[PDB]
Amino acid sequence: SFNAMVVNNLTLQIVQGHIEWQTADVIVNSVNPHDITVGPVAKSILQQAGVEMKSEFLATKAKQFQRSQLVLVTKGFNLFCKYIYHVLWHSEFPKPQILKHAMKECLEKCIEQNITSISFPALGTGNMEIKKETAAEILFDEVLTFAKDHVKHQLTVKFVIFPTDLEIYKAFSSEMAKRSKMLSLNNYSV
Ligand SMILES: Nc1ncnc2c1ncn2[C@@H]1O[C@H](COP(=O)(O)OP(=O)(O)OC[C@H]2O[C@@H](O)[C@H](O)[C@@H]2O)[C@@H](O)[C@H]1O
């Protein structure tokens, strides 16, 4: 069994744990921009970051928010991270399409803000009801695009699967196995 792969300058690991207890430069949240207190990832991150993060979210939303915005950045506050990238769900468009755009944008922001590590939950797989295999294929696709198109930018990416979401874990681990075999990647068990 394995839970990590290395491709070019990118390390990808699947972790069973809590997104809000990660240590990384960036931790990714998943919210309704009109109420960041709804949803288990959202509540998890908010309670751990603290109420000051919500204040900053709201103030940044007032300055920046528009229909085109898919990712809003705040500081990490009491989280063990520099920034939180809040993925914003606020349209009627197909959720896998939104996911793909939001994933690419989070990774592109890693260049802009010179980020060395980023930890994602299984975005879209809860309230947004994206099929586990679809979510896995999109997340892997965008990470591998990054690894090829931004080859000089070292990055450690973690996909953090809630401990009891075993079916999601298995879908992500199956995807890792498929990509690793095809690309002859070296795998690790941590
Ligand atoms: N603390 C946690 N750490 C890691 N993963 C978690 C945690 N809590 C929940 N998860 C998992 O994260 C995934 C995403 O679930 P949601 O939090 O429901 O988020 P998502 O499916 O992306 O939908 C976001 C939507 O829900 C609310 O934020 C709001 O309505 C927003 O638009 C699911 O697999 C869920 O079980």
Swiss-Prot record:
User: Where's the Macro domain?
Assistant: 1-180
**Superkingdom assignment:** Eukaryota
Where's it found, cell-wise?
Answer: Cytoplasm, Cytosol; Nucleus
Q: Point out the gene that encodes the protein.
A: PARP9
- In terms of the parent sequence, the fragment covers 308 to 497 of 854
Instruction: Consult the record and explain the modifications the protein receives after translation.
Output: ADP-ribosylated by PARP14.
Q: What is this protein called?
A: Protein mono-ADP-ribosyltransferase PARP9
Q: In the record, what disease is this protein associated with? A: Overexpressed at significantly higher levels in fatal high-risk diffuse large B-cell lymphomas (DLB-CL) compared to cured low-risk tumors. Overexpression in B-cell lymphoma transfectants may promote malignant B-cell migration. May therefore be involved in promoting B-cell migration and dissemination of high-risk DLB-CL tumors.
Describe its partners and assembly state. Forms a stable complex with E3 ligase DTX3L; the interaction is required for PARP9 mediated ADP-ribosylation of ubiquitin. Interacts (via PARP catalytic domain) with DTX3L (via N-terminus). Forms a complex with STAT1 and DTX3L independently of IFNB1 or IFNG-mediated STAT1 'Tyr-701' phosphorylation. Forms a complex with STAT1, DTX3L and histone H2B H2BC9/H2BJ; the interaction is likely to induce H2BC9/H2BJ ubiquitination. Interacts (via N-terminus) with STAT1. Interacts with PARP14 in IFNG-stimulated macrophages; the interaction prevents PARP14-mediated STAT1 and STAT6 ADP-riboslylation.
Upregulation details from the record are: Up-regulated by IFNG in macrophages and in B-cell lymphoma cell lines. Up-regulated by IFNB1 or viral infection. Down-regulated by IL4 in macrophages.
Q: What is this protein's tissue specificity according to the annotation?
A: Expressed in lymphocyte-rich tissues, spleen, lymph nodes, peripheral blood lymphocytes and colonic mucosa. Expressed in macrophages. Also expressed in nonhematopoietic tissues such as heart and skeletal muscle. Isoform 2 is the predominant form. Most abundantly expressed in lymphomas with a brisk host inflammatory response. In diffuse large B-cell lymphomas tumors, expressed specifically by malignant B-cells.
According to its UniProt entry, the function of this protein is described as: ADP-ribosyltransferase which, in association with E3 ligase DTX3L, plays a role in DNA damage repair and in immune responses including interferon-mediated antiviral defenses. Within the complex, enhances DTX3L E3 ligase activity which is further enhanced by PARP9 binding to poly(ADP-ribose). In association with DTX3L and in presence of E1 and E2 enzymes, mediates NAD(+)-dependent mono-ADP-ribosylation of ubiquitin which prevents ubiquitin conjugation to substrates such as histones.
